[PDB]
Structures are given as structure tokens and as C-alpha cells.
Amino acid sequence: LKIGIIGGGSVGLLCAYYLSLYHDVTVVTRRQEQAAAIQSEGIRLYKGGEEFRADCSADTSINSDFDLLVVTVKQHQLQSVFSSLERIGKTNILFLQNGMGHIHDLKDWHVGHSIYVGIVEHGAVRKSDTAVDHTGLGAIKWSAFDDAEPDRLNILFQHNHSDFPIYYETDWYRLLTGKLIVNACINPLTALLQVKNGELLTTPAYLAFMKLVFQEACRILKLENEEKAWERVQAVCGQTKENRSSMLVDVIGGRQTEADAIIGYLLKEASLQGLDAVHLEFLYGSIKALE
Amino acid sequence: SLKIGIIGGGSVGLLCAYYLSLYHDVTVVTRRQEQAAAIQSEGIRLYKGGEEFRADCSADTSINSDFDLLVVTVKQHQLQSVFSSLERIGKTNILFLQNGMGHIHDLKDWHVGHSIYVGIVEHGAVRKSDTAVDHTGLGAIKWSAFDDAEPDRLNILFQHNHSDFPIYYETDWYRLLTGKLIVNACINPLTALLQVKNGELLTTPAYLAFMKLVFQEACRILKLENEEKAWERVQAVCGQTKENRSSMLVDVIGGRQTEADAIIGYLLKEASLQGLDAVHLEFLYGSIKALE
Incomplete structure (x- = not known):
């Protein structure tokens, strides 16, 4: 299964590392320089004293049929993302933005995608274009939005690393x-x-x-x-x-x-x-x- | 003449020193010797809408006279040292013109032989330098007796003032x-x-x-x-x-x-x-x- 992570910030890189343990991951970023760097080096995760590296693709736009797109951009960057997502074939999209500012926008974003929302309880600090420090060992919790079917994400999230657990709520x-x-x-x-x-x-x-x-x-x-x-x-x-x-x-x-x-x-x-x-x-x- | 010490060389202190110097002998008691030296040197300048006046004034870094009146204009944070000096001098009249009311708790339980007065300053005044003040707001000073102080004690002191420095008693x-x-x-x-x-x-x-x-x-x-x-x-x-x-x-x-x-x-x-x-x-x- 192909997963696209939209945004190459701290949350996007954290998600990229852990999900790449199970799936083919591509980081979709706004900077050619970041894309190139991930394409060359993959993603580095630091946890406590320890460093690990995940192979990860990158790109500056969406060029594959992703089974899931995870949106991790800040509110400044959301409208441009909606426009991009309007230009692709129906798929699953999970928004992980902190707060609920984006929710007014989501309510009246009418598309054929299946929409999911979640919260990130992890702590993470981005160190460079390819590197992230997992500073707080938390979880992600998610739910279906507007009657999307939860089972579309169940297989994707069935198995995770014990430091990246994923919980569904109705x-x-x-x-x-x-x-x-x-x-x-x-x-x-x-x-x-x-x-x-x-x-x-x-x-x-x-x-x-x-x-x-x-x-x-x-x-x-x-x-x-x-x-x-x-x-x-x-x-x-x-x-x-x-x-x-x-x-x-x-x-x-x-x-x-x-x-x-x-x-x-x-x-x-x-x-x-x-x-x-x-x-x-x-x-x-x-x-x-x-x- | 009568002797008045102004405690504090901020905006209000300089403003009071200028105007009270027109009628009395004034010393500004400043915490910095450089200001005290500079006042004792070119006097105090007051700017008032296009006019500039100069008054000659004494200055010091300590209260080392027996003043007929002390006018306290310093920020609360320096008030503590002031009180400590106010104990080593002879009893006299002290007028507190402090902003806020935190000093009121200090005064409440103050065992001294001083006559205590309290007031507010409604002038606008802006310190331009160590010796200069701009009288930006033509207001007034209003004062009252605190506790059992005799108001008449300030009658001669405040008998005559510049038109632009009025002073009013409130009961x-x-x-x-x-x-x-x-x-x-x-x-x-x-x-x-x-x-x-x-x-x-x-x-x-x-x-x-x-x-x-x-x-x-x-x-x-x-x-x-x-x-x-x-x-x-x-x-x-x-x-x-x-x-x-x-x-x-x-x-x-x-x-x-x-x-x-x-x-x-x-x-x-x-x-x-x-x-x-x-x-x-x-x-x-x-x-x-x-x-x-």
C-alpha cells in the first residue's frame, strides 16, 4: 500500500518514519530541496540516544495513486493543499492538524474523498530536511469524518511499532x-x-x-x-x-x-x-x- | 525662605522643583550623583508649549537638611530606602505623591512624629533629561491630611503658586x-x-x-x-x-x-x-x- 504524507514538518517526518516500517511512503513537500534530500537520504529518526533510518520517497506534487494521504501542514498551508487534492482521484485523506481551526474548512469542503480526522499526541522536533527527534512517546487517535467508512484505514493501521500506536474512536x-x-x-x-x-x-x-x-x-x-x-x-x-x-x-x-x-x-x-x-x-x- | 526637599528626580520631581523654586528654597534629592551634580550645575529647565524657563535648584543624594516640607515622588520600589532615611531626620511635613496606593499600607502602620500628607498629581509631565522637564499637561496637585495631620501646617507653604501649578486641598x-x-x-x-x-x-x-x-x-x-x-x-x-x-x-x-x-x-x-x-x-x- 502506498501512503503519501503531505507536509515535511516534524509531524510529517515522524509519520513517515513509523509508517514506512509497514508501507511504501512518499513525503509530498513544497520544497524541491527537501524532496531531493529525502530522495537521497531517506528519513532519520532520533529517539533517546538512538538513531534509525527509514527509506522513504519524496516528490513536490502528487504523482501516484496513494491509498491514504496524511495531511500534516499548518493552517497557513491548508488551502493550497485542498486545491491539489481536488485535482486527484478519490482516495482516503487523514487530517492531523492541531486544534480545530481547519474544521470549519472541512465541513464545507465538498469532494469525493473519504475524510478522516485525528489528533497527534506525540512530541517531535524537526532537525533538518530529513531528520526528526521523537521527543514524546504518544499516540495518534483518529475517527471517520462525515460518514467515511473506518474500515478503509483499518488494514493500513492494523500493525504498528509499539512507540507509534494508533487508536480508532467512533x-x-x-x-x-x-x-x-x-x-x-x-x-x-x-x-x-x-x-x-x-x-x-x-x-x-x-x-x-x-x-x-x-x-x-x-x-x-x-x-x-x-x-x-x-x-x-x-x-x-x-x-x-x-x-x-x-x-x-x-x-x-x-x-x-x-x-x-x-x-x-x-x-x-x-x-x-x-x-x-x-x-x-x-x-x-x-x-x-x-x- | 522656607526649605522644600523633593525626593525623586523623575518627571514629577523636576516639575515640582521648578514651580516650588519660584517661592521657596528647593533641593532635589536624587539617587544618582550625576543628576544631583547636573542640577546643581545648569539648574532645572522647564518646557511649556514653546517657552523654556530655567530655575536654579540645589540637589543631593541624601536627605541631609531639616526641610520644612518633603515631597516624595519616587517609584514604589525605591520607597523602602526613603522610609529608612525618613527615620533619621527631625519630625516634619511629608507629602507623598506616589502613584498607586501600596504606600498606604506602609503609612498605615508608621510610627513617626512626622505630619503625613497624601496627594495626586494631575499634571502631564515628561522628563527630557537629567535637568529638563516638559510640562505637557496643565493640571493641578490635590492633597489631603493623612491620619491626624493638621492641614493648616501647609498654608504658608502653599499660600502662593504659579498659575500653572495650582494646588488644592481636599478633605x-x-x-x-x-x-x-x-x-x-x-x-x-x-x-x-x-x-x-x-x-x-x-x-x-x-x-x-x-x-x-x-x-x-x-x-x-x-x-x-x-x-x-x-x-x-x-x-x-x-x-x-x-x-x-x-x-x-x-x-x-x-x-x-x-x-x-x-x-x-x-x-x-x-x-x-x-x-x-x-x-x-x-x-x-x-x-x-x-x-x-
Whole structure:
């Protein structure tokens, strides 16, 4: 089976290494220089002290009939990808973008492809055009979008390396919002307060502010069980209690953030339902300023 | 004449030194000898809309006279050393013109023989150099007695002033100070985080709503007499300064210590003493402090 990975960023290279253990992989990239380099060297994965190399093809456009295309580009790059995908024969496409900003776009992208969405819980850092460091051993979880048939991806993902496990979930909306609610409540606050996830629980005022944010976002996302979801946010917080969140990390290092993909999404949905999002908008304004 | 020491050689200190020098013997007590030397050298220059005046003034790096009045204009962070000097001199009149109300907690439990006065500065003033200040905003100083100080003590001192340096007595120190604090507390922290000019608080629906939430906390902590009127004022002053970047926004952009402790930190201490919640104030404080 042929798999195409669209995007040669950290996530795209990580996916390329692990999936090439089972399948014929091609990295589809926007830079001829990256394509050539992968074509010559394959992909290098680092994990702990150890280095491994996977043979992988590359190309700057889609020139094969891929059984699956995995989209790993950032929101800046998504519209150009839709256009490319419109020019190919019906196949399976899995979008792995962080946040839910792209979902408005997906809802009204009407094509004949079978669409799947997923979340990447791994940590990865790109080192060069051909090299990636697997810094956090996580998982990928995926679901069918718009009634696509899950069994189209089951054979592809049946067997994986124990460090690349892949889990299916039936409800894509629950899947994406379960992750989004957590990131929305934690990431902005730790970025502005510059504290570990754990101090959000241990400072009564910070916990109370996170609850205000939660109550706004939970309403916007129309989550099924408010109290259970709030338990989960606090529980995910206690489990990651020593972590400087990803956005806090982006912040000390002056990298642009997932503010658009995470909070921007809540703002657009709040506007459409005529919902109030005072705390979310303040956080959005404050993080956009730091960028 | 009478002797006045101005503690602090920032914008307000130089402005007060210029105008009080017209009637009295002034010394500016500056922390840097180079400023003290430079004032003692070409005097103080004040710029006021096309005119430039010069006043001769003394200067020093320590309080080593018995002044008839001391006027304290330094940032809160240096206030601690000031207090320490204020113990080794003879009892006198001290007028605190500090921004914020963090000094009010220090003064509350201050055992001294000093007569304590407290006031606000409504002038616009911008320090141009070690010796020069631009009087950009023709305002006033307003002052009150703190605790049991006798107001009449400042009668002769403030009997005569330049038309552009008026000074007004107000009977209620707490109303005077809180009335300026409610405004600073609502505008400054918010602008510092959002990095927008003041007017952007009024014209962005969510930002205005967030300001209101901050106002409601601060208003309750301070126990402000007329709440509806104070809220109008906050929005009013926002309107008057629409194109301005607040002083706290400026401090944050510049990597300088802010007046968070004197503005917000005081409200936090007060919320705590009353078992009141101040969740928005606390988040603002933590975020501004994180930047320092």
C-alpha cells in the first residue's frame, strides 16, 4: 500500500518514519530541496540516544495513486493543499492538524474523498530536511469524518511499532473537542502566567479563572457532560502538572502559537451561536500581542 | 525662605522643583550623583508649549537638611530606602505623591512624629533629561491630611503658586486616592496585556466587558461611594486618552518594572483582608509580574 504524507514538518517526518516500517511512503513537500534530500537520504529518526533510518520517497506534487494521504501542514498551508487534492482521484485523506481551526474548512469542503480526522499526541522536533527527534512517546487517535467508512484505514493501521500506536474512536467530534477543551483551558493561562500546569490547580485564583474559561468554551463546544469535562480538564492538568505547556514553551522562545487554531476556533463558533466569550477574547488578544 | 526637599528626580520631581523654586528654597534629592551634580550645575529647565524657563535648584543624594516640607515622588520600589532615611531626620511635613496606593499600607502602620500628607498629581509631565522637564499637561496637585495631620501646617507653604501649578486641598484622602486608583487599575493592566491604545478598550465589545469585570472587583474592594458614576468616569478617561499608550503598557514594552504592586498588589491585599474575590485582578497581576 502506498501512503503519501503531505507536509515535511516534524509531524510529517515522524509519520513517515513509523509508517514506512509497514508501507511504501512518499513525503509530498513544497520544497524541491527537501524532496531531493529525502530522495537521497531517506528519513532519520532520533529517539533517546538512538538513531534509525527509514527509506522513504519524496516528490513536490502528487504523482501516484496513494491509498491514504496524511495531511500534516499548518493552517497557513491548508488551502493550497485542498486545491491539489481536488485535482486527484478519490482516495482516503487523514487530517492531523492541531486544534480545530481547519474544521470549519472541512465541513464545507465538498469532494469525493473519504475524510478522516485525528489528533497527534506525540512530541517531535524537526532537525533538518530529513531528520526528526521523537521527543514524546504518544499516540495518534483518529475517527471517520462525515460518514467515511473506518474500515478503509483499518488494514493500513492494523500493525504498528509499539512507540507509534494508533487508536480508532467512533465519534470524531468528541475526539477533537476532548483535546481542544483541555488545550484551551491550560495553554493560554500558562503562557500568560508563565507557570507549570500544576500551579493552575494549586492557586485558587488561577483555578477559578480557568473555570471561567472552561465554562465559556464548554458552552461554545456544546459538550455533553459539563461537570465530567471539567473534571477531566483538572485531571489532565494534574497529570501534566510539571509541564510548561506547549504555548508557554512557544512563548519563551518567541515562536508563533496555536492561538488561532485553538482560541480563534472558539471565537468564531461563539460569534455564530451569539455566545459570550469575554475571557477567551482577552486571552486571544493577549497571546496575539506576544506574537 | 522656607526649605522644600523633593525626593525623586523623575518627571514629577523636576516639575515640582521648578514651580516650588519660584517661592521657596528647593533641593532635589536624587539617587544618582550625576543628576544631583547636573542640577546643581545648569539648574532645572522647564518646557511649556514653546517657552523654556530655567530655575536654579540645589540637589543631593541624601536627605541631609531639616526641610520644612518633603515631597516624595519616587517609584514604589525605591520607597523602602526613603522610609529608612525618613527615620533619621527631625519630625516634619511629608507629602507623598506616589502613584498607586501600596504606600498606604506602609503609612498605615508608621510610627513617626512626622505630619503625613497624601496627594495626586494631575499634571502631564515628561522628563527630557537629567535637568529638563516638559510640562505637557496643565493640571493641578490635590492633597489631603493623612491620619491626624493638621492641614493648616501647609498654608504658608502653599499660600502662593504659579498659575500653572495650582494646588488644592481636599478633605477626604481616601476618596481622593481611590478615585484615581479605580481608573488606573481598570485601564493600565488591561492595556499592558493586550498591547492596545486606551481607546481600544472602549471600541472592542469583549475588552470593554472584561474591563467592566475588573471594575466590579476593584469597585467592591475599595467600597466606592458612587459605583455607576465611577464606571462612567473610567470610560470617560479612556475616551480622553484614546490614542495614548498607558504607562504600564510602556513599561512592559520596555522591559522595565511596572507599578503592578502599587496599583494591583494593593487591591489584592485589600480583597484578601475582606475575604473578597479578585480573580481577574489576580490573573492580571500574575501575568504582568511574570514579565518581570
